[PDB]
Amino acid sequence: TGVTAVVQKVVEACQDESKRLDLIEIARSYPPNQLRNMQRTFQAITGTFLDAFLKKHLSKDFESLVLMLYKPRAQLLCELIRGATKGAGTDEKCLVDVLLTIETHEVREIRQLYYQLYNDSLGDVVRKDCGDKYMWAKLINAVATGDRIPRDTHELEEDLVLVRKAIETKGVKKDEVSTWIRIFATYTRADFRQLHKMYSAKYNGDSLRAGVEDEFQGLDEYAFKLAHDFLYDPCCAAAFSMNVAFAGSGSDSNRLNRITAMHFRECKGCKYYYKKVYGQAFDERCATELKGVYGDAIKLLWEPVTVPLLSMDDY
Ligand SMILES: [Mg+2]
Numbered sequence: 001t002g003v004t005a006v007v008q009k010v011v012e013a014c015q016d017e018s019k020r021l022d023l024i025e026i027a028r029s030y031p032p033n034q035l036r037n038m039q040r041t042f043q044a045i046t047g048t049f050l051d052a053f054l055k056k057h058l059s060k061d062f063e064s065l066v067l068m069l070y071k072p073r074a075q076l077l078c079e080l081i082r083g084a085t086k087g088a089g090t091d092e093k094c095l096v097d098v099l100l101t102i103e104t105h106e107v108r109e110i111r112q113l114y115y116q117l118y119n120d121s122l123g124d125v126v127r128k129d130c131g132d133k134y135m136w137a138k139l140i141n142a143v144a145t146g147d148r149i150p151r152d153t154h155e156l157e158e159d160l161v162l163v164r165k166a167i168e169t170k171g172v173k174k175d176e177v178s179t180w181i182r183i184f185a186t187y188t189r190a191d192f193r194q195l196h197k198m199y200s201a202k203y204n205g206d207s208l209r210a211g212v213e214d215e216f217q218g219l220d221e222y223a224f225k226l227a228h229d230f231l232y233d234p235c236c237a238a239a240f241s242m243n244v245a246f247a248g249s250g251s252d253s254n255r256l257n258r259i260t261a262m263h264f265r266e267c268k269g270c271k272y273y274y275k276k277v278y279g280q281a282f283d284e285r286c287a288t289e290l291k292g293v294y295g296d297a298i299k300l301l302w303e304p305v306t307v308p309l310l311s312m313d314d315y
Pocket of ligand 1: 165166167168169170171172173176215
């Protein structure tokens with residue numbers, strides 16, 4: 001039903017703790033543009049801005065999640081890139097998570113919106129935020145400014161030999177930087193999946209992904225694994241990033257929030273791939289790592305929607 005009912009449901013969800021997950025049900029039930037229109041009309045209807053309302057009632061982690069959900073992906077990605085320098089350091093992890101998981105069809109609208117919102121170029125902003133020293137920064141710069149274009153069996157055969165050589169040498173040699181960056185930053189999904197298969201066919205079952213582990217450590221290693229998994233299959237990349245956010249003693253809520261908010265609408269296989277890859281059900285890991293409404297929110301967002309979306313305009 002219509003905007004009135006949705007705004008009332010939002011208000012009742014903040015005022016009654018048993019209704020908190022209604023905020024998530026709303027995120028999962030309407031197209032992002034309609035949720036954006038709702039949030040943009042919420043202050044005009046109620047007298048109070050949405051975030052102000054949410055902060056009175058919700059935990060920081062849960063309100064932070066909700067505030068990423070009521071907008072299209074392009075808007076969310078621009079705000080996350082901008083916010084990566086809200087401190088006076090750079091959130092490198094956030095920039096890597098974002099720049100490496102943008103589909104080709106989305107790139108132009110995002111670059112345009114970024115300039116439109118903040119009147120700087122996204123490429124310039126990324127280059128300024130990250131420099132060009134580290135492999136992860138070289139990789140995201142090449143993605144931020146570049147394009148992914150098709151190739152023939154011929155170039156893939158040559159690159160196979162080059163990437164095997166890079167994998168085989170200790171350290172990232174001078175002449176190898178070009179190899180890593182060209183493949184991971186400029187291949188299409190189709191060609192990347194072909195190269196992946198050709199590699200294991202040529203090298204007795206060895207994998208490209210295992211090679212990344214050989215060559216890189218720390219954030220380099222995460223960034224190259226993330227680009228690999230995204231190019232191979234986005235639900236793989238989503239499962240991998242969520243598994244990393246859970247790693248160690250506690251968990252990274254800000255990363256759990258953005259990975260979930262950036263990807264939950266596109267990636268229906270995440271929980272399934274998670275279980276396949278890690279051997280533990282996503283919800284079971286969630287149950288150990290997270291508690292209360294915030295935990296249930298993350299599990300619920302990642303649950304594949306199986307019915308058609310509502311329309312707020314259908315009134
Ligand atoms: Mg090497």
